[PDB]
Amino acid sequence: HGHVGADLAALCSEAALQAIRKKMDLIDLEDETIDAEVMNSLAVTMDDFRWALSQSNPSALRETVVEVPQVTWEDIGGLEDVKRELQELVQYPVEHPDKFLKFGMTPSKGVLFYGPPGCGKTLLAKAIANECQANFISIKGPELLTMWFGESEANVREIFDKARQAAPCVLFFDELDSIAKARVINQILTEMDGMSTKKNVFIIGATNRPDIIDPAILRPGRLDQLIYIPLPDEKSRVAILKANLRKSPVAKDVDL
Amino acid sequence: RPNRLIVDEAINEDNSVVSLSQPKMDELQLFRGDTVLLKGKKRREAVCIVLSDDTCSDEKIRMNRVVRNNLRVRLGDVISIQPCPDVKYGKRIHVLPIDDTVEGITGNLFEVYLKPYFLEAYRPIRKGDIFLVRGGMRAVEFKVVETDPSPYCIVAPDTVIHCEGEPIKREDEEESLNEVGYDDIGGCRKQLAQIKEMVELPLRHPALFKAIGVKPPRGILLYGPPGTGKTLIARAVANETGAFFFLINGPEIMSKLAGESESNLRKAFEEAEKNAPAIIFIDELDAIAPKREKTHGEVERRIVSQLLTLMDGLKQRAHVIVMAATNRPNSIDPALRRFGRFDREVDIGIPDATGRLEILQIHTKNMKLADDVDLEQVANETHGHVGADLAALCSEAALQAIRKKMDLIDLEDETIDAEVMNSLAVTMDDFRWALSQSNPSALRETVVEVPQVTWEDIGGLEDVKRELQELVQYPVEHPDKFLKFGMTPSKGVLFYGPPGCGKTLLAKAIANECQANFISIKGPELLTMWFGESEANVREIFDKARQAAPCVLFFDELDSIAKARVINQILTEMDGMSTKKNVFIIGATNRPDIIDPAILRPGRLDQLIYIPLPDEKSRVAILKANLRKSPVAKDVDLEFLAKMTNGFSGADLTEICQRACKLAIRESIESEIRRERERQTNPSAMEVEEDDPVPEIRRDHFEEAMRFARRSVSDNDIRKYEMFAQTLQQSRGFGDFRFPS
Amino acid sequence: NGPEIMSKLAGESESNLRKAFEEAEKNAPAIIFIDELDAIAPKREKTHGEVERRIVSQLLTLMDGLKQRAHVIVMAATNRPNSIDPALRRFGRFDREVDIGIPDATGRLEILQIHTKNMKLADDVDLEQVANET
16 A cells, blocks of 8 residues: 555565565575576565565655545444445435525535544445445545644645545545644534535544534534444444454354 | 595795695596686686696695686686687886886896796786786886786797886786785674675676566665765675676766756766676765755756766666665655665664774784784774774774874884884773773664564563464564464464563563564654654654564654644554554553553554563573673572562562672772782781782671662552453453354 | 855855865865854755755765765764754764853853963953853
């Protein structure tokens, strides 16, 4: 992750050089002129690639990445009301844009999750992005408040027009109350009203202290719906428990 | 392969002669009148005719002195011999008297030193050969520099003479001895091996790299602190192969007129393109290409763009690589750190303790030392010194040894006799003087090294040892079993306990055990970033940890900014750090409740290991450990001293083994007062032997130094850590359950 | 002199520096002296032009271009070591740095003993007393 094409060319050349360097038993000093044996009878193996990935090649990437996620709906079972609501708020304005035009109902532009910390909020937000075949960017808390700690408040316009460039996206804040420990909420607030509605970008924000939030974010037009994420129930628990044991071979008599 | 043989002494006087063994004749099949080349050190060779004799051993060649010196080989070293069928006659080899033993003869001397010496042998003479001819108490060696055939020549007597030039002095030897070898540079053996791996195999084998299709490098950055010989290393790599150096100086291509420096750069790159597989070198890049903020004019921008265009205008078939030399990679214009110009960046950093022994071993070569000196002892100190600082140390110690000998180096003898010139050896207190009285170290930044503390330095804590082994050793010693069932490794622990119970002395132990590097930043080094608002200055100390792959970076008192940010600056960096690198982040603290809870989120810093007060076995271990240097009396018990000190922290009983040393040094100073202040100090009944009243720390010194002991940690604050340990739920709840049958 | 090799035309001061270093190289074991170095080589912040940077680099190149057999040493004279361009405090150019600081009380007696040489003093004066003050 983070490699570019030139970095991958460098990876291929270094893996080939490591495969040469393990064959110094034939490429000797007594044979200065190298015979035609090892020139065409040397194939690279997998641990050479793993060495060349591990031992070297720092990635030249730190900024955001646009992609479609690969998580699925059954990765977190249950929450059928939340699934129905997110389908009603994401899928229907893009899969059927004409029926929303028959009787003129305008689509909403974003929900606000809230619940206990670590109940699969991001793992729920990526599921609808994967289901709609929609791109998904994500900025976090520490990426957010380092803007206003060094007073770079006017540096969300680029991360919004980058979302404008990828048309079917759902930009996801995470812990946007992180600056509510003591601005940039106003900088998103002046940008969200300037964003048009014919583009189908949605703004889902997550939080853990829903009372400390600014009430101006809850005005109708900006962020209206308030979906509550509860603790995981039984079927969701067995689903996530099976989901985390994809890689590990587990004994067949281990009950879940 | 039977080519390389050791060289030993010879008896015969004939010159350009190599001794072969008579049992091995049929493998080479060359007879007596055949010429051979001998591979020597520092890429200088010589040519000889063979002699087949029985006085040589089976694998040892008997050869004379001047061709042993032309190969620069001595007793024990192994040389190669190869046949060379390109024997031919030549015209006007340029002989030259290079010694001061000519005795003032000028003109044509070559009718008795050249013409009778060379005949009936087919004498092979290579360029630079240092053969001598002795005649009339005049042993003149003619080192030739211009041979019209290549590479060696057979001298004919009908060769016309050309000897209008003047014989010169030993200065031409001083420009040939700086064709240095690999052994002439020390302190950076790992980085020398890595750069040799990077450079040497494209250069000696240009065809295989094109054959597979890999790309040789186009630009290497040799960044490091200034003065560590970053130009000597490039000379050594280039001269250890068949390269061609070209030193472009830094401010020399700045001190030209406007519109003329680029002509010099174009001429230099053209000379690199025209010649062999070669290497140019640019020292002090940040004086011709600084950051963009340090560019108020525009001609420097023209020079920088000229450098960029000439750098990218090279071909992979030209076989030229570019090495630059800065001090820090953020002090360059970042427009030339893109792919194709300057990507691979090595760090010839500060030499360590045992990396400092060879760097003054190579400097104490021509200086006669006595037997009392100990290079290991001075190597143990002099932290922060660089190679130039150690050269200055050697010169100042030699000057102090001269300056103590002013009793013979007098004003009445203006011309100094040859006595003290070769009969003066430096002793150890001269080195101690030159270290103490002078030489401030030019180092303040961090240092990467493996620690030398051991696991038994702090006994006990077997659970903590098991946990640290499980969190450090197993992700690096067995990386495949972590890949069998996909468990990802953790990226850092958080110690917490009472102040001064061996936290850093525990953190260095696993770094030493894993043979892993260990950097360490502290509290006052941390919060001085955000007191002067240099918050974005931890990226360099993290990518420095990226450069040294098996490291464990150790914060210390990271709650020091929690007296009233940079925690967020580490927090945005820790998630961006990948996991295939095996760098771990161990942070220590003393107030675990005041810490930011965002550091405790799973993924960032999860495990919370509690360090208790030292127990009994740990106490006797640290007590024995602090008395390594001091000789202690054999009846001084320590187990009785162990179980008496019950609630003492690890930083309190390390104080009493200095208070006892101070209480014994007071009495050892005081005992010398009365012994020199003896009334009627007569030669009668004089103690010619040293009485040594306090040779070691006795028992009553500890019995009196214990009286000032005081426990630092109370009972009310160890309960704070017990209560914080109870704030972690501590495996409480349901308890034991069983799976159904 | 310091500002004397600044009061020349452009492109001519370096000719004077080269002539001076050549005269040092040609003559005996000798010593040149540069007074007021911080007027021809200040810190980098006090360099708004570029010709001063050409002079500074010329000084660096001619300084490093000497040989140990030439027997010439260079003494400069500043007031504080942080008031110099730190690119010439590296090893090989300017390392050893002495401090002829302020003279003390009894160090002040000889400095006016050497000044009261040609002046006839009476018997009532006491150089120790004035040395105690000032």
